[PDB]
C-alpha cells in the first residue's frame, strides 16, 4: 500500500474535474507566470529572414481544484497527467513552424504542490520571423523578436507574467550559441498588448540583438575587389609601346569585376534596395573601368602629341591610387560608426 | 458556481449528434468567414506557388448549442471542437497546408448564449497560382485562394464574407521583398461539379514586381559589357592579336551571365522580356567581334580604308544601342 495511497489522491482530484474550463471561470483572471531557458540559440537563416531557437518553456499558474493533503508536498507526475487537466494554450505570434520534441517520450514536466500551484514546462524548437533591413549589409545589426501569448483567452480571462525580474526571467545557456556569422550581444525582455478582431490579448515579447561578423565578407568579396583594383592600376607603369599588353589588362580586369559583381549576389538575399556592399563593388567597378578609359586616351594622343600623352600618364600613377585610398577611408569609417 | 457552468456545458453535449449539420433536413446553414492575414512569403516562380499564414475565422449558428442563465461568452478548451459539428471548409488550390500545433493545436471555440459559434484556426498554406512570365520581370500577377465546401452543396450550406469588404484585414502590413501588393478583392459565387453546386469564396491579390533588383543583377551587368566592346574601336589595330582575343572573351562573358540567369527561373517554352534584352545585347557584342575580324582581315590590304571604318564604329554602335533601349523600354512599359 505504498502507492495506493497516492492512487486514491489522484483519483480523488480528477473525480468531477472538468478540463474544458479554466480555473476561476467567471470569478477572476487566471494568472500565468512564464520564464524561458534558451538551451541553444540556433542559426539565423538570412535568406528566409528567420532564426531557430531551442527553449525550456516554463509556465506556472494556480488551480484550487487540485488541492490535497498527502504524505508528500510535491507530486512529480507523468507527462500523461498533463492532458487530464487544463493548461494554457500559449502560442508564438511570429513562429513559422515549431517542434515539440517527444523523443523518446513527450518532453513535458508536470508538478503539483499541495496548494494547487502547478508547474508545467516543455522542450520546444521555434522558428520565428525576423524582419531585416539589409541596407548596411554586411555591417548590419538586427533585433529579432519572439512573441508569445494566449490564443483563445482575452486579457480579461488570462494574463501572462514573468516569473522574476524581466531581465532575469529569460536565461541563455553559456555554450548554446550555435551562431556562425552573427554574434548575440544580449536580449531585452518586455510585455505588451495586442488587439484583434476577437478582443485584446496580453503578449510577452523578447528581443534578441545580433551583430553580423564581417570577417567572412572581407576575405571572399572585399579583398578580391581591392586586389583587382590594384591589379588594373599596374597598367599605368607599362611603357606605351606595349599596346597588346595594356589592352589585356584593361579588358580582363573589368570582366573580373563583373564576375565578382554577380558572385556577390549568391550570398546576398534578394532585396530591392542596394546594400552597402554594392556601393563598394560599384565604385571599385568605376575605378578599373576608368583605368581602361585612361589608357585609350593616352594611346589616342600618341603619335599626335606624345608629350601630352606622357604628361597624363604620370598623373594617373598618383590620382588613381590616392583617390582609391581616400575612398576606402570614408567608406570604412562611415559604416563602422553605426 | 463553476460546477453549474460544467453542468450547462455537459447538458449541451448530451445527445448532440456530430454526424448531422445544424438545421438538418431544412434550410441551409449560413457560414461567415473572416481572414486575418499574418504574413505572405516565398512567392516562388519556379514552383509557381506562395505561402500564406492567416487566422481563419468561421461564424455559424447551431440552435442545439444555446444556453440560458450564463451572461458570458464561453471560451471552451480547444479540444471541445472534436465533439461539435464544424464546416468541412477546404482550399481547392492548396498544395500542402497545416495547422500550427505549438504549444498546443492553435484553435478556438467560443460559444454564445443564442447558439452562435465562433471557430478560429491559424493556418499556414502553400497555395498554387499560375504565373504568366511573358513580361518578366516587368510583369504583374494575380494569385488567388479558393475557399469551398467539400461535402455540402448550396442546398445545405451557404458562404458569405462577414463584414463585406472588411472581412480580410492585415494586407497593408505585408512587405514582400520583391513584389508589392497593389490590390486585393473578394468574390462570392457558386461552382457546379458532377455531384451538385457548391458555394465558393475567393480571395485574390494583384502583385506587381519591383524592377530595382534586376537593374543591379541583369541589365547593368549586361549594359557595361556591351560598352566594353565599344572601347575596342578607339584602340589602334597594331595590337593585332589583342582586339580579337579580347572581343571573344567579352562574348564568352556574356553567355556566362545567361547561364546563371536560367537557374533563377523555371523552364518555359517562350521568350520573356529578360531574354529579349540579353539576346539583343548578345547581338551587339557579337557584331563587334565580327566587325574587328573584318578590319583585322584587311588591316594591311587597305589600312587607310580600315581605319575609316573604326571612325564610324565609334558613332554607329553607341547610337544603335541607344535606339534599342528606346524601343525596348517603350514597348515593355
Amino acid at each position: 500500500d505504498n502507492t495506493t495511497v497516492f492512487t486514491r489522491i489522484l483519483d480523488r482530484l480528477l473525480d468531477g474535474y472538468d478540463n474544458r474550463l479554466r480555473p476561476g471561470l467567471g470569478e477572476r483572471v487566471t494568472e500565468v507566470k512564464t520564464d524561458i531557458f534558451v538551451t541553444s540559440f540556433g542559426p539565423v537563416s538570412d535568406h528566409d529572414m528567420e532564426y531557430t531557437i531551442d527553449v525550456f518553456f516554463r509556465q506556472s499558474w494556480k488551480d484550487e481544484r487540485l488541492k490535497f493533503k498527502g504524505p508528500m508536498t510535491v507530486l512529480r507526475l507523468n507527462n500523461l497527467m498533463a492532458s487530464k487537466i487544463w493548461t494554457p494554450d500559449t502560442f508564438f505570434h511570429n513562429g513559422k513552424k515549431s517542434v515539440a520534441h517527444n523523443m523518446t517520450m513527450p518532453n513535458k514536466l508536470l508538478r503539483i504542490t499541495e496548494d494547487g500551484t502547478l508547474l508545467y514546462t516543455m522542450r520546444l524548437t521555434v522558428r520565428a520571423e525576423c524582419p531585416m533591413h539589409l541596407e548596411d549589409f554586411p555591417m548590419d545589426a538586427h533585433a529579432c523578436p519572439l512573441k508569445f501569448g494566449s490564443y483563445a483567452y482575452t486579457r480579461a480571462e488570462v494574463v501572462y507574467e514573468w516569473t522574476r525580474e524581466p531581465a532575469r526571467s529569460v536565461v541563455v545557456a553559456e555554450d548554446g550559441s550555435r551562431l556562425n556569422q552573427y554574434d548575440l550581444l544580449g536580449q531585452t525582455v518586455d510585455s505588451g498588448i495586442v488587439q484583434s478582431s476577437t478582443g485584446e490579448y496580453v503578449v510577452m515579447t523578447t528581443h534578441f540583438h545580433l551583430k553580423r561578423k564581417i570577417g567572412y565578407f572581407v576575405i571572399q568579396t572585399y579583398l578580391p575587389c581591392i586586389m583587382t583594383v590594384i591589379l588594373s592600376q599596374v597598367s599605368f607603369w607599362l611603357n606605351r609601346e606595349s599596346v597588346p599588353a595594356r589592352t589585356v589588362f584593361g579588358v580582363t580586369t573589368v570582366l573580373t569585376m563583373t564576375t565578382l559583381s554577380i558572385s556577390a549576389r549568391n550570398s546576398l538575399p534578394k532585396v530591392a534596395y542596394a546594400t552597402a556592399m554594392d556601393w563598394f563593388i560599384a565604385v571599385c567597378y568605376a575605378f578599373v573601368f576608368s583605368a581602361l578609359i585612361e589608357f585609350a586616351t593616352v594611346n589616342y594622343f600618341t603619335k599626335s602629341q606624345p608629350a601630352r600623352a606622357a604628361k597624363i600618364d604620370r598623373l594617373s600613377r598618383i590620382a588613381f591610387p590616392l583617390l582609391f585610398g581616400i575612398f576606402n577611408l570614408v567608406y570604412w569609417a562611415t559604416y563602422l560608426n553605426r | 458556481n463553476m460546477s453549474f457552468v460544467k453542468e450547462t456545458v455537459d447538458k449541451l453535449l448530451k445527445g448532440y449528434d456530430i454526424r448531422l449539420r445544424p438545421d438538418f433536413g431544412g434550410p441551409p446553414v449560413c457560414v461567415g468567414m473572416n481572414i486575418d492575414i499574418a504574413s505572405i512569403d516565398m512567392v516562388s516562380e519556379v514552383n509557381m506557388d506562395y505561402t500564406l499564414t492567416m487566422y481563419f475565422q468561421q461564424y455559424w449558428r447551431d440552435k442545439r448549442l444555446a444556453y440560458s442563465g450564463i451572461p458570458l461568452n464561453l471560451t471552451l478548451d480547444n479540444r471541445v471542437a472534436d465533439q461539435l459539428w464544424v464546416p468541412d471548409t477546404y482550399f481547392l488550390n492548396d498544395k500542402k497546408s497545416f495547422v500550427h500545433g505549438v504549444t498546443v493545436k492553435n484553435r478556438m471555440i467560443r460559444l454564445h448564449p443564442d447558439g452562435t459559434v465562433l471557430y478560429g484556426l491559424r493556418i499556414t498554406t502553400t497555395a498554387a497560382c499560375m504565373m504568366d512570365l511573358r513580361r518578366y520581370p516587368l510583369d504583374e500577377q494575380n494569385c488567388t485562394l479558393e475557399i469551398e465546401s467539400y461535402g455540402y452543396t448550396t442546398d445545405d450550406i451557404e458562404f458569405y464574407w462577414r463584414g463585406g469588404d472588411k472581412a480580410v484585414t492585415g494586407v497593408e502590413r505585408i512587405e514582400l521583398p520583391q513584389f508589392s501588393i497593389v490590390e486585393h478583392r473578394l468574390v462570392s459565387r457558386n461552382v457546379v461539379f458532377a455531384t451538385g453546386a457548391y458555394p465558393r469564396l475567393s480571395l485574390s491579390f494583384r502583385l506587381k514586381r519591383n524592377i530595382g533588383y534586376f537593374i543591379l543583377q541583369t541589365y547593368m551587368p549586361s549594359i557595361l559589357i556591351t560598352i566594353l566592346s565599344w572601347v575596342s574601336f578607339w584602340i589602334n589595330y597594331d595590337a593585332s592579336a589583342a582586339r580579337v582575343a579580347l572581343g571573344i572573351t567579352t562574348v564568352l562573358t556574356m553567355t556566362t551571365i545567361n547561364t546563371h540567369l536560367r537557374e533563377t527561373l523555371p523552364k518555359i517554352p517562350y521568350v520573356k522580356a529578360i531574354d529579349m534584352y540579353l539576346m539583343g545585347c548578345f547581338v551587339f557584342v557579337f557584331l563587334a567581334l565580327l566587325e574587328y575580324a573584318f578590319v583585322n582581315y584587311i588591316f594591311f590590304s587597305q589600312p587607310a580604308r580600315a581605319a575609316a571604318i573604326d571612325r564610324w564604329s565609334r558613332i554607329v554602335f553607341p547610337f544603335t544601342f541607344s535606339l534599342f533601349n528606346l524601343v525596348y523600354w517603350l514597348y515593355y512599359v
Partner: nanobody
Amino acid sequence: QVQLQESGGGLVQAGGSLRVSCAASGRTFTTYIMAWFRQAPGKEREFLAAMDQGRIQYYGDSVRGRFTISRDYAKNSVDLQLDGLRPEDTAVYYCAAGAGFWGLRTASSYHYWGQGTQVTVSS
C-alpha cells in the same frame, strides 16, 4: 529626404481628449517601430508608447491605461490619443521611427525623429 511631420496638440483645460498625429514621408515604415517620446520642460526625454509591425502596443510604466497609440499602415502614420490629461503632462511630444536595436524603450534606438509638438494643460 525622410521627414516626420507632426500635427494636432495645443491647449486643453485639466482633462479632455487631445489627439496628436504624425505623418511620415519619404520612406515606407511598415517594417519599422513607430514610437512617441515626451520631453518635459527641463527634466528629460521620456518614453510613452510604441507599435511594431505586428500591432503590439507597448506603453510606459506611467501613462499606461490613459494614452492609446494606433497606426494607419496604409497612410504611413501613427497617432496618440490623450485622455484624462493632468497638469503635469505639459511637454513637447516627439515622433520617432526605428528598428528597436538594444531595446525599443531607449531613445538612442530611433534613427528618425520628429520636430516636436507642444501640448499645454492648464488647471
